[PDB]
Symmetry: C2
Subunit: 614 residues, 2 copies
Amino acid sequence: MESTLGWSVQDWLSFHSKSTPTKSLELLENLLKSQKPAPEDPAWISLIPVEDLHHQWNILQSKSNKEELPLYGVPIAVKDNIDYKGLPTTAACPSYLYQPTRDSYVVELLRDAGAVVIGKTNLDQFATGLVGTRSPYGKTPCVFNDKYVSGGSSAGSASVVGRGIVPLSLGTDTAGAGRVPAALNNLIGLKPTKGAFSCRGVVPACKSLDCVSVFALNLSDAEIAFKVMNKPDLLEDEYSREFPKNPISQYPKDLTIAIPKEVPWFGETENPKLYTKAVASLKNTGAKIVVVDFEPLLELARCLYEGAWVAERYCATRDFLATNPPESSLDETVVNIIKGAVKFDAADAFKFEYKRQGILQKVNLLLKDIDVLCVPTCPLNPKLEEVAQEPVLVNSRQGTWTNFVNLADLAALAVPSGFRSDGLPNGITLIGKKFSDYALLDLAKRFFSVAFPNNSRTYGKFVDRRITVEDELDGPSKDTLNGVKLAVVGAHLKGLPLHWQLQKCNATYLSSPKTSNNYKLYALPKVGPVLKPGLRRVNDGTGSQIQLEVYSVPYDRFGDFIAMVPEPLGIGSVELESGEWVKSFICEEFGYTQQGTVDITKFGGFKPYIEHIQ
Amino acid sequence: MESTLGWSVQDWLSFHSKSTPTKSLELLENLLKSQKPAPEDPAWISLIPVEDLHHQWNILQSKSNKEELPLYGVPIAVKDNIDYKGLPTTAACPSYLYQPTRDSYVVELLRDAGAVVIGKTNLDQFATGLVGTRSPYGKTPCVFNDKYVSGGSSAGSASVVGRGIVPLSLGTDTAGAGRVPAALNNLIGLKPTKGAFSCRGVVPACKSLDCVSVFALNLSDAEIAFKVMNKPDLLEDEYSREFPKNPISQYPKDLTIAIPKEVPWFGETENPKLYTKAVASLKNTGAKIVVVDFEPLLELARCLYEGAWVAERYCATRDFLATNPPESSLDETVVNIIKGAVKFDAADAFKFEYKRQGILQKVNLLLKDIDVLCVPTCPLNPKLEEVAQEPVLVNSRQGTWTNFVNLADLAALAVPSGFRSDGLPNGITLIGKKFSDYALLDLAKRFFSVAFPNNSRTYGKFVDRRITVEDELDGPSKDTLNGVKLAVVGAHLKGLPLHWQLQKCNATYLSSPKTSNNYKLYALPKVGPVLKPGLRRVNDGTGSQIQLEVYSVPYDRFGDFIAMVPEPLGIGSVELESGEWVKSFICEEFGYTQQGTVDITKFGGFKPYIEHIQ
């Protein structure tokens, strides 16, 4: 009838828009029928019954402003880690199987945004691994080549978006499980700033470090997902934390990107090529690339390995393990790992925590200079064979670049970097300070325009298709501003010499209105190398309207900005064509009174004027 | 010659400034000699031998700013918990004795600022207790009466400062040891924001909760000590953290002060009479007292008794106990409290941390609303023999207000509230948010001037002496500032109706310059109930000089300020008498052109014209 495989969020929406509440249930009805559970498709642990689909779809029908839910009837998958009321939760352990009577906060949000859950996706037992092989439900393969591992622990979620069954899936990520699988499947892996997404209704692994995460095929959809799940939840998740107002949206073009001085590849020879390339590619966005000694960070990861954090896993599972459940239910590697906790007492937990904080001091000194870390997502693309032969060594290696991110409270975005000779994908992860998530998205779009020029970027398994438009970003929503509505008229307008002064203060554009009928404009005598105007409210009726640009300037930032404003300009209030009043550039009478003040009200705004003695 | 007993820091300083080095030294020697170690004075574990005094004195004399040193030649004591290189550190356990190479940073900062260490003071063993009695070296009495307990664990430090022996002492505070001994000895106990004062070179107890603290006879001395010790030490104390720029120096006159709904006294009859009177004096300062459910805070405190924090003590101390050490050198209650930690898995420790985090989510919501908490410092004035009956009960009742402050990351100040009919002191601890230390000191001063009207405040044992000038405050020094220099000319002046807007944005007064003679001042048409002026710069030589006050407004808070500036005023710039420019209130043309404007230039400033107009 049609083919859904590889449809973006947008694709799915526009279909549903020009189609009907039965014909678009048809498409979902048999997308669901085309899927297999169990051992037959190792990617899916359970699928929704056909009747559950109907039920979700009914509720989607009560919703009254349908063509506004940013995710209306978009199918999605969820690590069998994260509760959904419709299906059981397992954590890739058949005997751990419980039924939640309530959605995950995060599922609940996406359902409210109009999404349809399709089934619980397969993971490394108890989210413990970066391979994707450590599950009794089966070994999920890389979407490109069945000799190859999918990555873990979010194995099924990466696989199912990778072959485009679904445009979005959820994973979790403590130490790489939402990053490593992006690389191996040519996907986008967003590891949100910690605490931004709630973990209510997700089974605890390392609670104090855990994050729900998202796989998509493009920046576009990753953003949509992130906007929908970045929601507080304080009283029901002990590690939730509200995002601040005025989140940055875009780094400066010459932002500082650190790359590591020592890069271990462990024998790999293809992956270093793609990395080297990626860096050069950043250089040509105009980023300042600086080579940094990552020792403190690798010190921080050695904590995770030597410390008692394993005991978090133990804390979460020890009652169940005392149940002494059937052995064919447990992955021995996972169980063994988790029981390492027994050797650590309360005092050791603290001793290691002291060490964690010590290293954080160093780590915080390093990051103060730097905006973004660029890191290979992972050294290897392991074969199923290699991890069977080395079930541990391979796992550690895949943890090289991912382990420190959560312990240092950073945000990260795993993004594709091209293809090795053998036709398999790898990538880089961009790591930013907390709350930088929209800016990471933005920086990735900027890296894509260089590294896959024109529109050559590929997605998931679809090596023969091209992103045109699906890597575009909304940026943060208006909901998130809390600034001063300030109007500009001169050097601060788009393109004019001082518009940077607005960007340095993460000013956000609002609109281009005109002043009311009350105003006059003047070129003041050129002192510096920039020519500047100067508004004037004068009411002997003789005033027309001047062309304005209005920007929200974040409250905590306005000082930074007004420090740059010299005599005889200032910030007062100008009345708009709207009758509304708004903070704005004004001028001491003195300024427009000097010799060589040209009246410029004639020309409508400052724009025309500064181009005709030009 | 005269008696040193009860001398302020300033007493010490003005003697040295009017005396010869030799004569000063004599006074220090005499002082030193009049002291007796333990057991004959239970307060002192060790005194410096005369040759260390000389050695200290000499290092002082080597300095070429010696007079400009805020603590020049002031004697101080330090808890036998805190390293001074000239004496042994004990933690009040004879067999723990060791002899440090270097000073603890905090003592090193005191020394650099001129302090002379006279000796190490007695504590509850390993700083475990709120009573002062858990010590092999002796049971230190309340400086007011022999049959009463000094309070712990900083027991010595409160004795010597209470007896006017030394104007400043160092203690530590995990769950009340900097606070309870102040209430009980009529002292000021400053417990700073976590991480403000370094913990390098102090023996850990609950390392993730430890603060070094300060006792003093008066606010002024506490502030001075604070300013010297509040310095970052990130690379050598993994819990050290720098104060940000622009710390608040004063709460608004009408700040919110929370008190508890339910206030347990455990059969105390005297103490509640003091607490109620303290509450009333604070109502009398203009404060808004709110009755708050303290349940969440009390949940956090019983997190510490029930939880695995006691394992931090074990952590600090297990190697030492393994070396099966002499029985007689140990306090059995103490070692039992500590050995109680072996019950706890790493995984239990995390479980308790999850809970702690959950309670904090509730605490931080409860507190956003509030500026300060007012709490009885401690319910009881325990007698020595009451403690010998109840070596555990009394301890924990004394903990009913102290146990949540550090777990929640708060600042605190234990301050005196008067005397119970039987002649004993108690008081009030004021609890503020992180980095609020300066404003807490100022609030205490405000409290005093109502609680102890026309200079009738007592200090230490000195029931017959009167605080004249020593509770006065410098506020934070100017190098803590980072703001926009802003001139005001009108209703924002000191004493005028809109001045509150500068305090509410945490503005700091700089000075009172005039403009250059290029200025006119106008009283704008009275519209609201608040009259307003406007500056006009004019070139034509017809200007004059107008009074201003110039403030520093944190860059941080300037948006909040400008947001309250309406049409026709603005913020631009003023040239000062000095030729310097400086942000200033300015005014639209349209402002001083309106029907009803008065030229007010002849008055040389807004204030003279308001008083004339009356």
